[PDB]
């Protein structure tokens, strides 16, 4: 069996290429800018 008539068709596909690039300031996250939090934070060094 050999094809005689035919068709064409467009299909779509979708795939991401990037991401929502973020950033987290530590002071306004782990502290909330209390003076107490920044001074126990030195006991963890430059972990942030």
């Amino acid at each position: 069996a050999i094809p005689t008539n035919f068709s064409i068709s467009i299909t779509t596909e979708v795939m991401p290429v990037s991401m929502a690039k973020t950033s987290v300031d530590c002071n306004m996250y782990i502290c909330g800018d209390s003076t107490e939090c920044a001074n126990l934070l030195l006991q963890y060094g430059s972990f942030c």
Binding site: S23, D25, N27, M28, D33
Partner: protein, 49 residues
């Protein structure tokens, strides 16, 4: 009501207890600092983002 909360539970809206004037709270200002340099071989002048 006396105080509003945001979509996360931090108080961003204060009604004044004295004048019943309702006010938003913004953060103070925070962000990041970046530095622009052409290279220490090239100059000694910087731009700051």
């Amino acid at each position: 009501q006396q105080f509003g909360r945001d979509v996360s539970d931090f108080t961003d809206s204060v009604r004044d207890p004295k004048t019943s004037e309702i006010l938003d709270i913004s953060p103070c200002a925070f962000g990041g600092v970046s530095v622009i340099t052409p290279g220490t071989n090239a100059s000694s002048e910087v731009a700051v983002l």
